Each structure stands twice: as structure tokens, then as C-alpha cells.
Amino acid sequence: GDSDFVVVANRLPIDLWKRSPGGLVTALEPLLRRRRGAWIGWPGIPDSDEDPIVDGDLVLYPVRLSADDVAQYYEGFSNATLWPLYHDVIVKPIYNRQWWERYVEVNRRFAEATSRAAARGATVWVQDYQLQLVPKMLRELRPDLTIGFFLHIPFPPVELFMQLPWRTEITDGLLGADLVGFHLPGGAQNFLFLARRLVGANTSRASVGVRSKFGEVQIGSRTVKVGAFPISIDSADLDRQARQRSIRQRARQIRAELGNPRRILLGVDRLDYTKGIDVRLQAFAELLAEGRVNREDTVFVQLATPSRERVEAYRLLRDDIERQVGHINGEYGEVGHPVVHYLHRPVPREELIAFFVAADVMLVTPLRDGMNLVAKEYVACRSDLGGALVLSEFTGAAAELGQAYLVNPHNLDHVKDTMVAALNQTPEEGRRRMRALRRQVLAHDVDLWARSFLDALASTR
Amino acid sequence: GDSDFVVVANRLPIDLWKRSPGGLVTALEPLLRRRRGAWIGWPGIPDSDEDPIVDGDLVLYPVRLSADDVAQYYEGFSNATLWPLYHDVIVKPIYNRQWWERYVEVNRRFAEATSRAAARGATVWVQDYQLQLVPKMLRELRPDLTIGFFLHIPFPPVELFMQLPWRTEITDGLLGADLVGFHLPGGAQNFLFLARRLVGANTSRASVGVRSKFGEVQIGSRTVKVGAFPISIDSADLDRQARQRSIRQRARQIRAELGNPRRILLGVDRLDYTKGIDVRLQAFAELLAEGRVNREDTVFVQLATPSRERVEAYRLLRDDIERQVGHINGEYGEVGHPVVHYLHRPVPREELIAFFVAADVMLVTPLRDGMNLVAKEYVACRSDLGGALVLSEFTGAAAELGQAYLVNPHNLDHVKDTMVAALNQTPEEGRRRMRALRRQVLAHDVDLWARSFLDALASTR
Amino acid sequence: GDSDFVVVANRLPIDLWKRSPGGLVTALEPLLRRRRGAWIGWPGIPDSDEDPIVDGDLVLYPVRLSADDVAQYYEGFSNATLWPLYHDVIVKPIYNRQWWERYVEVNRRFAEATSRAAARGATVWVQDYQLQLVPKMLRELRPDLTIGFFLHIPFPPVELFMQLPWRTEITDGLLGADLVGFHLPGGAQNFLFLARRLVGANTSRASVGVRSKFGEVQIGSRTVKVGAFPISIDSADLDRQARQRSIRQRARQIRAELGNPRRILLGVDRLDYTKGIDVRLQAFAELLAEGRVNREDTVFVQLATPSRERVEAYRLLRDDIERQVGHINGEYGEVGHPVVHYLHRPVPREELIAFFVAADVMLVTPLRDGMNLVAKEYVACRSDLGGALVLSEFTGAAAELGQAYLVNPHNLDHVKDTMVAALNQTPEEGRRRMRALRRQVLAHDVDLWARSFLDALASTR
Amino acid sequence: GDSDFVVVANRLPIDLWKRSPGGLVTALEPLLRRRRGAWIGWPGIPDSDEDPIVDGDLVLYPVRLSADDVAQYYEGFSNATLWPLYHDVIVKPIYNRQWWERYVEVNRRFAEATSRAAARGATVWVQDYQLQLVPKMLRELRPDLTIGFFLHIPFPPVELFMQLPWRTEITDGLLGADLVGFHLPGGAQNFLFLARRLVGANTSRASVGVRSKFGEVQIGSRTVKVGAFPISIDSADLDRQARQRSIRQRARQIRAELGNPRRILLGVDRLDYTKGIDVRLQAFAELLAEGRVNREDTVFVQLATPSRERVEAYRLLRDDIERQVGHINGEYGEVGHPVVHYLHRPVPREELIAFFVAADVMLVTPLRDGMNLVAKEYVACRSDLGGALVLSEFTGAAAELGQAYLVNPHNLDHVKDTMVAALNQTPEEGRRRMRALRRQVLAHDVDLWARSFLDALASTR
């Protein structure tokens, strides 16, 4: 092809077709202004053409997938084998050979599309868990390419990873890259250990730094760089948007519609068993029972965005959460006044930002999360320095957002203590924490993340 | 004893101790003003004295029961064997011999207390399913007594009744009475058939009338009268109470607190799997999904009063209903505006009456109910002739309240159609139905019921 | 058509194609030798021709059904709505309007095939629950026809039947017949009461006799005869077959393969939740635990024939029974010697008969069964007068086989007592019972049943 | 006290009281012949005296525990918090603060008993997961003592360990020892990493060897040694016992009682969800369905010894396994001939050894196991060099028994392939593997293990 910079991801950065706002595609904008860039991904419609589509500063290469392909490669292998395994087997992974075989076939198809688009000596950046075979497949097809890979979800400990019948094929797949990145040093170090134990490769033994002090795996003639690059958001843009009059007006209206509570707790999550929504609800219920939260002036809003309905674990999870909601309101609410407001639906960006601005306490309590950008978005939105962030230790975000109220979500007593603390914090203490969190998030944004990964990758040449 | 009229019931008509208002004890007030009356029952506290307590127009004879007695006779046999069996095995009855043995022991203890209180030739009125052995036991102890029995729950068809390992002992128990009454002719006719089939007794073969045309079972020397007497409420008193200023003011306030909806649907039930609460919620959810009910101006309030928490079926039922509530609000509500308000708690009388007055549509959809007084209470409260009653055919009330919107709760399509019809009825049609329902309920009150049963019983002398 | 006697049933009396042995088609053989007979039914293959097929003493009229037709009319309405409802809602019926609509369509299609085959003034005999609309539909199409209907499953009490949203359509459907027959007077009497209550028809009020003392329903100009005709088997043929040398040799071999136990208990059932297989296993387990059955010389063989695998209730039931089997053997067996032998597969006729001959105790403990021919087959096979029959009261068979050891399957204590009694009966007592049972079964065979129904039907002319 | 060598373990090495044979107490016999030894542990009876009991070469110090103590410290914290967590959360750990508090109290009580028994400068060896706080508690009470700790179960990866609300207290507890040992280098390395990450201690960074190349944790003034010492059995004694005439005769009798199968597969396990019994049964069932195992000449015997019945996970597991057994026999067995023989009961040593000798294929397929001595016992018993060992990679045993047929139990396709391979191996290949396995197990016995740990501990002085 004629592209010297190519992004490979499960989906094209579009929706219907119009280019999707924000995210990775926006972070890379100034690079695309200096490169001949291309994006390889599934257009999100079944059995479509693979004809390249010129869309501004990108050429888009659509990967043809059937509904059956999506069911077995994505809904299957990716979301019901890899996802639960990598997230500390919160639910039991399903090991299915037909899913594996389709995952291989689809990965090869992404690899072929990438080669089709990539010019000689081009830099290629492959994204996430659904495409872990692509780097090896691409290097075999195109040994001239410089290949980076970034995993957006946790990389599990070796004791769990080893369950995968195709553990070696996945590992070799990743080792096809010149640079393998994770959010956290822990993931990088697990990968180094896996390389030694499973593949018998020689690796570096030192701790892995943040955006520095990289690890190495020796694979015959070449070296694989291994690093930690924690993702972030466009902090400055969110900070700007949350200041808009219409957003502030909507935040006031939200509080009014809730019957002007003294305190609003807020949860915002893609519905997933990794997110610890059940833990929040349990803690809230027990605090109400104990009279430690005032049922007359405190309300919990949980916004769950629909996710992966075709996967049974997610339907069962939705059932459990919805029971908790009904139960808590039946026990502690009044007619015309729930203590929990729960919505299961997509939330427009402007509405989400209004909720961040309205919320006195942000509850981000995942059991295991790669990063969790919601936590960072909340911080960026609170330029008024109001609010409080309650944050699980088991998110990548906790390594950076140490001034938040950190919790072990498995320690329910301390989750409860912490929610009371956040709800009753002095104005000054809340400001101290939020100022410190904002200093971190404003300085460590998605631009820094992307430049750091690309600088590390370029250095492998 | 020195009492010539004795009521026997599971519980004394008191609570703490102060005499409980309304109900059977109030209906019998003018009779107690002319008789030396007594009431035999468990005082509701474990291991208490059985010393007679003079309380105004009654002498109270407390029956001593241990917590273990209550667990096996009441929670066990009564509520987990007899209750589900008599209500068309909506859940599976548990047949347990230890429960049976305790049920026999406790019944004998009620019988002994009754004899202790009853003067020679006294009239005795035994109440309900928990005490079905008492009439036979009492006749053996005291053949001088005139004994009536009234079953407040349905009497099941013979095909189901026959499951009971102690079917014959229960039947003989009832046949100890001079008069056996049920709400409905159907129950009386089942009893007649059971007597012939199981006990081989000679009975009348004709249809049984309402408060007339009684059936007969020949038991050796004596005849057992069998009748249908549908219970009711103190219609005039409720009609009066619902007109009070404070009640009307509270009804307006309820509508205001719900965000002034155009239409309020109301369910009020003791939480029980017989009540068809799940059916209401399913119908409401599907109407919302279909856009046949407006989620912006219509709200459903369900008031569930706690019941029988020590029985697993009831805890499981509560879980299912609470899931439906959470689910429906998550799907169709807005923050600050649920489409379903659900409370699980006792409701004070004045509050309940305010809800009846506020409610545009009363949803009474049991799978199987002896009578259902909530339906009649709603009618009595609507002297403004507003509102609409949606009523299951499978309640005793449906035989009298034919002008309501009757439904087969198993026919979900028609339940849905009917809820739309009730919600959108013309003012005139609603008034026509409510006027007709009130004529019935005002004329057929608990006084008529009690006099009719007692006249039938007295006639057996 | 040219047929003056027509049988209508869900399936043709064939299999692949060769004519199926025994059953109704064999019972009617001497009638077919004097009539121009035809059989209407589904050939058991999807989307086949409806071309008449001359097969000896019958003309076969195949009804075309799609796999979707079978799924919704048969697997759906028939087996998941009607079957559980008619059998005392042992599992919850599913009420589904699409299933109903297909059931109507298919019934009409059977009606049209029947008219196609039937000559003027022909006698038509419609069979079973899957075809309850046919008599009315046929009378409308062909008012010249004489129509009989026989229900092979129980007819439920009115309190349960009334759940059916299409209760009236089913009842009108049956009332299209000149004669409606059931195994038992109880079913006939339920039908009479249903006719009065639901349809408001004038009926006879007397008890219904066995093959006599028929009931009547007046339907405008015409009268519907209602009767009880308990089905049976070809007793003499089974008696003859069980005497064959090869059968007796196989029975000895069975005992040898079981390690020559002193006592063999046997269950033989189509796998169904109506059959009470779980109750047998529970009783056996508790007797072993109590040391009341000797685990060293007593063995239980349960033969379950596969049934209705596409219906979830049946898969769940299979799971429960299979757990009980594993559990009991794990607790009381030895390596090389189970106390329970369980097979889930079809059993050839000759093998079944060998098991009847080998079995010391036949366990037939259904919760609810129309008749249960297995009980009668066992009796007919025991010309040696050995063995013992333990029989649920809730089978139609119990009305005739009173000399068996009758049990209420809900009374587990008495089921256990009875199994011990049957296992330890004196030789003389066992012979007394078996002689008496055989006298009944040899005299009341399928020939008597069929002649009695056809005589009653002919009499309606 | 007067003891210079003290073993601390959850239970005393006795049963009723007579001293229990084999195990750790027998391995230490020659050391006790040269030391003044004592054993601290719960005598296995509730609320007993703590009076020292002289029993030969040991003084026994009984720890008083109530039934409530056992319920919360052992059944609770140990078996329902720590056990599932350490075994890769195969089931969800329960985090309960009351259990934790009792675990602390009981550990302190073991510590106090130990100090009571231990002379100045005595060597103390604490055993297993139930007593992880003892080393720290003991060092505080008795800083003169030399303390070793050996964990008999896996030490989990840090990502899972960190879930424990009391993670730091457990880690500090272990760090109270002079020597911390695990079966495997993996456990030692997890512990080293945990020490750095959670406790911030300076550790060695190198790989940990087997019985060599020890790790170190620096804790202020002192160093903690960390090592891997894989436990084993008394190989020579088992080898001798399996040669006894009566054992060989019983093995022949077992095959005869199974109907002289060509091949016997054997599973022997304490019933536990870690053991992968469900996987064996699934593989066997699918091989039968596929016709890859001959249902006429191949049989599977599973011996499950009862374990932890008071823990719900274990009762649920038993239910699942027992269903599989019933199902497989129903599908593939014949009357008088199951394909699976399953016993749930304790098995006497001599009987177990006879089964090892009879078994053609030993199936040891745990999901996660510290070591698994059953695998080694089988090997030691096969001096005839017959048999085959199918062994999960996820057992500590797999690191030593590499010549067995190793499987990933999550890779069901390969488990199935491997069972066919083991069943059909040539005599020569089977002998080659068994000879090699025996060389390892005969040379690496429990004596070597115990001397190696004690030499390492002594070296810390």
C-alpha cells in the first residue's frame, strides 16, 4: 500500500457513516497531519466490501466479517474466552476450539488487510486483545514492517494465563511485535515472566518503569521491547467542555429532578461483571440499614450502558443488579422518592458530563479494570474542585490517582467506611484531593500516552 | 366456662397489648353486646400464660405456643403444606409428618381452650385453615356444643386435595362442625364431593346457593350444613373515612410527589405468590415496550406488605418481583422519574386509603384468592365515582364485582388490553362501573356476611 | 371419501415404512375386517405429501406438517400447555398465543383430511389431547358424520382447566362430538361440570358409571353423550408371549447379570415428570439409609425411555433423576455392584417382557397418569403368579387394580412402608394378589374397551 | 517447655485415641529419636483439655477449640476464604470479618501452646495454610526460637492474593519465619514478589531453585529464607506393601467383580472442586459418544473420599459429579454393567493400594493442586511396571513426573486424546514411562523432603 503509518483495531473509527469523535483516532490527529495514515478494522456491518475508503486524514480499510465470524471470533473467543481470563476469571472462561479457529482466521484476515495498506518500512500499531495474533502473522507476511502492540485490558498472572489451551500461540502472537505495551508495569512483568516460563526466551529481569525502563525479550535475531504506558483522556478538552453554561444548567436541573438531595453518589459504567456495580449497591444498602447514610437527603444514581447482550454472563449480571435496585428502593425509598436511580441505556456525552458535574461522590469500584477512564473524566470535569472520587485499587487508574479515596472492593467494611468518609468530607479536604488529582490528569493526557508509545516504537528501528 | 358465644381463631384480636381495630372482632360487636362472648387464640408471644383476660365485651383465652410450635404448626403445616395446596399448588406443597403431628397437637390445644371457655350448649365459631381439626376434636370433648366453621381461603378441587397424606383426618376434622362455610359455592361443592368420594358419606347433590340453598352431609345421627357466605368489609365505615379532608389532601400530595402523572396504577397486596404481582409488572413492561402506555405520564405504584419471611417461597418471590421493578425502571424510567414505585413495608390504614383515592386504576390480579378485600375497599373509597378496578376472575370477589374489568391473569394479552382499556376509559363509563360496584359493596358488607353465617348456624339447633 | 369408519390420531400407525404392531390399530383389526376403514394422522416426517396410501385393511391419509408446525402445535401447545395443565400442573403450563394459533390451524388440517376420507354418514373416532378442536370443526364441515372423541390423559378439575385462555374454544371443540369418553368417571364428571359452569349448558347431574350410566350435555338440537371407558391391553397376547422359552431364559440371565440378587425392583416408564420416578428413588435411598432394605441382596432397575427432549422440563427432570442414581450408588453400592441400575433408552418389547418376568416388585408410582398400561402389562406377564405390584392411587389403573399395593406417592412414609411390605410378602399373599389382579386384567382387555366405546357411539345414531 | 523440636499443625497426629500411621509424623521418626520432640495441634474433639500427653517419642500439646472455633477459623476462614483463593479462585472466596477475627484468635492460641512446649533456642516447624499467623506471633512471644513454615497448598499469584482484605496481616505472619517453604519455585517466587509489592521489603531477584538456590527477604535486622521443597511419600514402604500377596489377590478380585474389563481407569481423590473430577467424567462421556473408547471392555472407577460436607461448595460439587455418573451410565451402560463405578466413602489403605495395582490408567486431573500424592503413590505401587499415569500440569507433581501423560485439564480435546493414548499404549512404552517415573519417586521420597527443609532451616542459625 501507500500508507507509512497504519492503525489496526477491531473496529473502524466510524459509526452510522460518520467518523466517530474523540478517542484514539482524535489523539493521533497531529500525527496523521504529517503521515500517510490508514486504519484497518471491521466497519461494524456484516458481509461488507473491503474497498478502501478515503475519509480525510485517513484511508479506511474495512475488514469483511460475517455475523457468524463476529459471533465466534468476537462474542466467543474475545469476549467469553479471553476477556474473563485476562480479568482474573471473575467469571469462568469458556474454552472452545471452534471459537479459537475462527479467531485465528479473523486475525489472519486483519493481517492481510494491514499488509495491503502498509507501504515498505511502514510503522504499524495493532490494538487490543481481539488481535493478539496479528503481529506474528504480519511479520511473517511483511518482515519489513515495524510493529507495535498495545493491550488495553489487564495481562493476567501466569497461573491463570496457562489455562488457555492456545497459550503458546497467543504468546508467540504478541512476540511478533517490536514493542509490546500494557497500561501497567505489572502487566509487562507478567509478560516477561510468561516469555521465560512458557516460551523459554531470555528476558530482562528488572522491574519495568512507567514510560521508561523498558523490558526486553530476546527472540532469535531480534529483540522485543516491553513497556508500560498508561492510557488517559483528552483532559484539557473535557475540562473545557464541563465549563459550558448548558452543562452547568443541566447539572443543576439533575439535582432539582432528584428532589434536591444534599448528596448525590454516581456510578457510570459499561455494564460488565468487572465493574463492581454489585459491590456499590451492597455497600449502599448496608449503610442505609445501619443508618450511616441518610435516606432522606442522599441518593445513588447508577448509569449502566448496555454491553454484550448476546453473552449470557452479562444478562445474568443485569438480572442481579436490577434485583438489588428494586430491593434497596423497596426497603429504604418512599413513593415519589427512590434512594437509587438506575438507567440501562446509552448516555450522550453532554449528559454524562452534566452528571459528573452534579455528582458529590463518584463511585468507581471495579473488581479488575485495565485503566478506567471514567475516573479520569470525572476529575477533569471538576474544575470547581468539588466532588470526591472513590476508586478501586484494582483499576490501572489507581496507580496514578492515589489522592482519590482508594478501596479494596473485596473489603466491604472499608468500602462502606470510605463512602461515608467521601460523603462527609470537609470542603477543604475534598478540594485538596481534587486539586491534586487534576494536576495529575491534566498533565498526563492521551497525547502524552500516544507520543510515549510511538517514541518507544520508533526507537526499535 | 361461662361463655355462650365463642370465637376460635389462630390469633387473639389484639396487638402490642391493645385491642386490634376493625375486622371480625368489630363486625361481631353488636352480638357481643347481647352475649357472654369469648375469644380463643394465640396471643402472638411465645410461651405465655393461658390465664383468661377480661377485655371489655370479650373474655380472651390465650393459647400457649412455643416458637417451635409456631414454626411447625403455622409456618410449616399451615403455610407451607395447606396454603399452597388449597391455592391450586401455585408452589409445591411440602408434606412433612412432623409438621402434621404438631398441627394435630396445637389444634387439640385450641380445642381444650375452647371447652374451657364454653358454657353448656354454647355456640362456637371456629375460623380458618389453621384450625380444621378443632370441630371434630371439640365435638368429642363437648358434644353439647353447636359448632360452626368458616374457611377463609379457597377449598381446592378433589384432585389436588387428595395429595394430602392426611386428607381423611382433615376432612373428618371439618365434618365435626354443624355448619361448614366457604366464600363461594365452588368451595362448598368441592367439599360435598370430597365427602362422598373420600369419606363415603351421603350428601346433597344440588348446586349450593349464596347464603341460601345449603348443602348437606349426613354423618350418622347428625347432618352437617354446608354453605357459601362471601366475606366483605365494613363498607359504610370505609366510605365515610375516605371522605375525610386529611385523606383527600394526602391523595393530592401523593400525585404531586409522583410528579403529577396523568394516570396512576396501584397494586396493594400482602406479599404472596397467590397475588399475581409478577403478572402486573410483566403486563406493564410489555405495554411500555409496545408504546401502548405513555412512560411520560403514567406511573405504577406497588405496595407490598411483608409476609411470612421465614418461608423460602416468599423470599424467592420477593427477589423476582424486585428484579422486575429494577428492570422496568432501568428500561423505561428517567433519572428522577421511575415508572414503577415499589415499597416493601406495612402501610398505615390512613395512608392506604389515601392511595385508593389517588389511584386511577386499581390492579388486583391474583392467581387464586379466597376473596380479596382490597378490591372491595377500593370500591368503597371511591365515592367520587372516579377510578377503575381491574380484577382477576380467580378471586372470590369477582363473583360479586362483575362490573369491574375482569381478567384471566394467565391470559397476558387480555390483561394488557384491559389495563389499556381501564387507563383510557371515558369518564362516564368509569362512573357507570364504579356506581354499580359501590351499590353491591355498600349493600353486601361484613355485617350481612356475619349475620347470614350465624343465622345458618343457629338454624342447625 | 369412501371410508365408513375413520380413526383420527396425531400420528399414523406406522414407522420407518412398516405398520406398527399392537396398540389401537391392532385392537380394531376385526372391525376393519368388516368396514371400509381409514386412518388420518401425521406420518412422522416433515413436509410430506397428503396422498392416500392403501396399506392392507386400512387406507392411510397423511397430514402434512412442517417441523415448525410440530414445534408449535405439538411440542408447544400439546406438550407444554395442555399436557402439564391436564396433569395437575406438576410443572407450570406455558400459555403462548402463537402455539394456540398453530394448534387451531393443525386441528383444522386434520379435520379437512378426515372429511376427505369419510363417506356419508360415516363413523369417526378422534383420539386424544392434541386434537380436541377436531370434533367441532368436523361437524361444521360434515354434519352428516357420527363423531366420537376419547381423551387418553386425565381431564383436570375446573379450577385448573379455567387457567387456559382458550378454555372455551377447547370445551366447544370437545362438545362437537356425539360421544366424549375418558378413562375414568372423574374425568367425565369434570367435563359435565365444566360444560355447565363455562358453557352454561344443561347437563345430567348423576354420577357417571364405568362403560354404563352415561352423562349427557344438551347442546341445542343435539345431545352429547359422556362416558368412562378405561383403556387396557391385549391381555391374552401378553400372557402368551411372556411364557416363551427365550423370554424366561432372558429373565434368568438378567438376574444372573445383576449378580443373582434376592430381590429385584423394577421401574419402566416413558421419561416424564408425571411418572413419579424421583419418588421411587427417594424412597429407596431412605430405606437403604434406614437399613430396612438389604443393600447386599436387593437391587432397583429403572428403565427410562427417552421422551420429548426438545422440551426443557424433560431435560431438567432427566438431570434430577440421574443425580439421584449417581448419589444412591455412591452411598450404598460397591465397586462392581450398584444398588441402582438405570438405563435411558428405548427398550425392545421382548426385553421389557423379560424384565417384567424377572422383577419381584414392579414400582409404578406416577403423580398423575391417565391409565398406565405398564401396570397391566406386568400383571398379564406374571402367569407364574410371582411378583408384586406397587401402584400409585393417582393412576387410572388403580381403580381396577385394587389388589395391588396402592400408595399415595406424596405420602413418602407409606411408600417406604409399602415397598418393604412388597419386598417381604409371603409367597401365598403375593399369589393371592397376583391371581386377583390377573382375573381383572385378563377379563378387561383392550377389545372390551374398544367394543364398549364403539357400542356407545353407535347408540348415538 | 522442655522440647527442642516442635511441630505445629492444625491437628494432632492421632485419631479415635491411637497415633495415626504414616504421614509427616512417621517421616520425622528418626529425628524424634534424637530430639526431645513435641507436637502442637487440635485433638479433633471440641472443648477438650490442653494438658500435655506423653505419647512415646512425642509429647502432645492439645489446643482447645470449640465447635464454633472450628466453624469460623477452619470451616470458614481456612476452607472458604483461604483455600479457594490460594487455588486460583476456582470458586469465589468468601470474605468475612468474623471468620478473620476467629482465625487470628485461634492462631494466637496455637502460638501460646507452642511457646508453652518449646525450650530455649528450640527449632519450630509450623505447618500449612491454617496457621499462617503463627510464625510472627511466636517470634514476638519467643524471639529465641528458630521458626520454619511450610505451605502445603499453592501460593497464588499476587493479582489474586491482593483480594484478601487481610493480605498484609497474612504476609507479615509468614515473614515471622526464618524459613518459608513451598512445594514449587513458582510459589516461592510469588512470595518474593508479594513481599516487595505489598510489604515493600528488599528481596532477592533470582529464580528460586529446587531444594537449593534459596530466595531471601530482608526484614530489618534479620533475613527470611525462602525455598522450594516438593513433598513426597514413603516410596519404599509403598513399593513393599503393594507387593503383598493379599493386595495382589484383591486387585485380581476387583477386576473379576468389574466383569473382567480389558481396561480399568481409576480416579482417587478427596472430594474437592480443585480435583478436576468433572473433567474426567466429561472426557470419558465424550469418548464413549464418539466410539473412541469401547463401552464393552473399558470401565472407569472413581473413588471420592468425603470432604468438608459443612461447606456448601462441596455439596454442590458432589451433586454435579453424581449427575454425571448417573447420566453416563444411563447413556452407555447395560443392566448389570455400568461404565462408571462411583463410591463416595473413605477407602482403607490396603483397598486403595489394591485399586492402584488393578488400574490400567490412573486419572489425576486437578485444576490446581499443591502436589498430589496420589500420583506418586500409584507410581510407587507399580513395581510390575504396568499401568499409565495421566497427570494434570496444574499439580506440583507434574514438575517431577514429566514422563507421565501430562494434560492441560482445560484442554478437553487433548485430555480426550491423552486418555485414548494411555488406554492403547504399547506394553513397552508403558513400561518405559513407569520405569522412569519410579526412578524419580523412589529416589525423591518424604525423607529427602524433610531432611532438605530441616537442613535449610538449621542453616538459618
Tab-separated table of C-alpha atoms in Angstrom, chain A residues 250 254 257-258 295 301 303 318-320 322-338 341-345 355, chain B residues 250 254 257-258 295 301 303 318-320 322-338 341-345 355:
chain	number	residue	atom	x	y	z
A	250	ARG	CA	-28.236	20.619	33.218
A	254	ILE	CA	-30.478	16.980	37.558
A	257	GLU	CA	-35.187	16.429	39.379
A	258	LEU	CA	-33.738	14.258	42.139
A	295	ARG	CA	-32.117	8.029	53.280
A	301	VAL	CA	-27.544	7.274	40.556
A	303	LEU	CA	-25.937	4.718	34.782
A	318	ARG	CA	-28.008	-7.384	34.665
A	319	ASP	CA	-30.608	-9.517	36.470
A	320	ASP	CA	-28.630	-9.422	39.740
A	322	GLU	CA	-31.665	-4.957	38.796
A	323	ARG	CA	-32.807	-7.072	41.759
A	324	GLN	CA	-30.540	-5.071	44.094
A	325	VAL	CA	-32.009	-1.827	42.789
A	326	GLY	CA	-35.598	-2.966	43.286
A	327	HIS	CA	-34.748	-4.338	46.711
A	328	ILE	CA	-32.989	-1.226	48.044
A	329	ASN	CA	-35.754	1.109	46.902
A	330	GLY	CA	-38.453	-1.176	48.321
A	331	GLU	CA	-36.678	-1.173	51.687
A	332	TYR	CA	-35.484	2.461	52.023
A	333	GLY	CA	-37.278	4.627	49.484
A	334	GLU	CA	-40.585	6.427	49.615
A	335	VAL	CA	-43.249	6.756	46.961
A	336	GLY	CA	-42.053	9.546	44.707
A	337	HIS	CA	-38.532	9.235	46.141
A	338	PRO	CA	-36.211	6.312	45.386
A	341	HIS	CA	-31.988	5.745	40.320
A	342	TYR	CA	-30.856	3.183	37.767
A	343	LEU	CA	-30.826	3.548	33.993
A	344	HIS	CA	-29.780	0.903	31.494
A	345	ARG	CA	-29.146	2.778	28.259
A	355	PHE	CA	-23.844	14.067	35.737
B	250	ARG	CA	-52.836	13.266	51.225
B	254	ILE	CA	-49.250	11.649	46.574
B	257	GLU	CA	-44.904	13.622	44.837
B	258	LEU	CA	-45.215	11.343	41.814
B	295	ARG	CA	-43.973	6.372	30.012
B	301	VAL	CA	-47.266	2.120	42.440
B	303	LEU	CA	-47.291	-1.513	47.849
B	318	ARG	CA	-39.680	-11.078	46.686
B	319	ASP	CA	-36.429	-11.493	44.731
B	320	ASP	CA	-38.303	-11.995	41.437
B	322	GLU	CA	-37.748	-6.758	42.954
B	323	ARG	CA	-35.818	-7.727	39.809
B	324	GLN	CA	-38.831	-6.810	37.646
B	325	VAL	CA	-39.056	-3.425	39.342
B	326	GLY	CA	-35.376	-2.646	38.825
B	327	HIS	CA	-35.562	-3.870	35.246
B	328	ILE	CA	-38.632	-1.852	34.216
B	329	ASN	CA	-37.291	1.379	35.687
B	330	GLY	CA	-33.868	0.836	34.101
B	331	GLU	CA	-35.522	0.361	30.707
B	332	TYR	CA	-38.319	2.993	30.741
B	333	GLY	CA	-37.708	5.458	33.553
B	334	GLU	CA	-35.670	8.622	33.715
B	335	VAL	CA	-33.415	9.890	36.463
B	336	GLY	CA	-35.736	11.499	38.977
B	337	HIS	CA	-38.718	9.702	37.419
B	338	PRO	CA	-39.336	5.962	37.781
B	341	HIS	CA	-42.627	2.889	42.631
B	342	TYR	CA	-42.323	-0.167	44.853
B	343	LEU	CA	-42.418	-0.281	48.642
B	344	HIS	CA	-42.000	-3.361	50.802
B	345	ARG	CA	-43.362	-2.389	54.206
B	355	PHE	CA	-53.628	5.736	47.874
